[PDB]
Design a protein around this ligand. Structure first.
Ligand SMILES: C[C@H](c1cnn(CCCN)c1)c1cccc2c(-c3ccc(CS(C)(=O)=O)c(F)c3)c(C(=O)O)[nH]c12
Ligand SMILES: [Zn+2]
Ligand SMILES: [Zn+2]
Length: 232
């Protein structure tokens, strides 16, 4: 009824949208992994009379549900999608998207890693993002490669019309007490990658983590802090 929806409010398989700013929504879904249930976020950005999707809803049936929810609540077609790293909470559902006519994109680094993991593989490669600090435009967003953090390939997304920073899994929510799933992370480089985000997007007004509640720029420093406590 208005507050951001949390893991225990979303049954696995359903998707909810949350209006972030004019023409910007997050999408929230939940999924089981190794016997526990987790929420995860993605983004939807209006692109004239079309929509740009950032990240799947973590699984084929969740992603089908995402498309249905977008049709019900927004009613504009999703024409393109970008996945911000290779894990299943970002690419699982790409095959559903591709069968629904969505053009799916990721960096070559994400595509390679997805293929090697046995995860679904976006169709199109995003060049111009291979060195930390790189930025490219993609529809109504800017894609930025901050360097290795949660994963070596993680991208962040900025919506300049609204000053919305979508951190993906490189950014954690304020209530987080540890650094999430770090199996593919670079804990030593993560703070430097966060500092690059902070320097490049000093006017961000909303910061959205890969999992959990949006907030403001605090999420960036908090992320660095929880990652340092983990490496320690
Ligand atoms: C799909 C993904 C994954 C990551 N790696 N692998 C290994 C490769 C295997 N094929 C799979 C995955 C599965 C389960 C949970 C998480 C969390 C996560 C966990 C806990 C928290 C709470 S917290 C910050 O307080 O610790 C959280 F927010 C997110 C994150 C994240 O961190 O992005 N990914 C997750
Ligand atoms: Zn991940
Ligand atoms: Zn994640």
């Amino acid at each position: 009824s208005g507050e951001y929806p949390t893991v225990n409010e979303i049954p696995v398989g359903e998707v909810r949208l949350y209006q972030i700013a004019d023409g910007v929504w997050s999408h929230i879904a939940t999924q089981s992994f190794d016997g526990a249930v987790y929420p995860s976020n993605g983004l939807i950005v209006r692109d004239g009379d079309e929509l740009l999707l950032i990240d799947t809803a973590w699984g084929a049936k969740n992603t089908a549900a995402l498309l249905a929810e977008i049709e019900k609540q927004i009613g504009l077609p999703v024409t393109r999608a970008v996945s911000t790293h290779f894990h299943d909470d970002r690419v699982g559902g790409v095959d559903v998207l591709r069968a629904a006519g969505v053009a799916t994109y990721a960096s070559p680094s994400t595509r390679r890693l997805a293929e090697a993991e046995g995860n679904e593989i976006p169709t199109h490669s995003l060049e111009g993002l291979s060195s930390s600090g790189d930025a490219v435009r993609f529809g109504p967003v800017e894609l930025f490669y901050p360097g290795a953090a949660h994963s070596t390939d993680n991208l962040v997304v900025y919506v300049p019309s609204a000053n919305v920073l979508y951190g993906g899994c490189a950014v954690h929510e304020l209530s987080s007490t540890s650094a999430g799933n770090v199996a593919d992370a670079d804990l030593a480089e993560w703070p430097t990658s966060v500092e690059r985000i902070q320097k490049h997007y000093p006017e961000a007004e909303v910061v959205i983590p890969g999992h959990g509640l949006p907030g403001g720029l605090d999420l960036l420093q908090h992320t660095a802090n929880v990652v340092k406590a983990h490496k320690n």
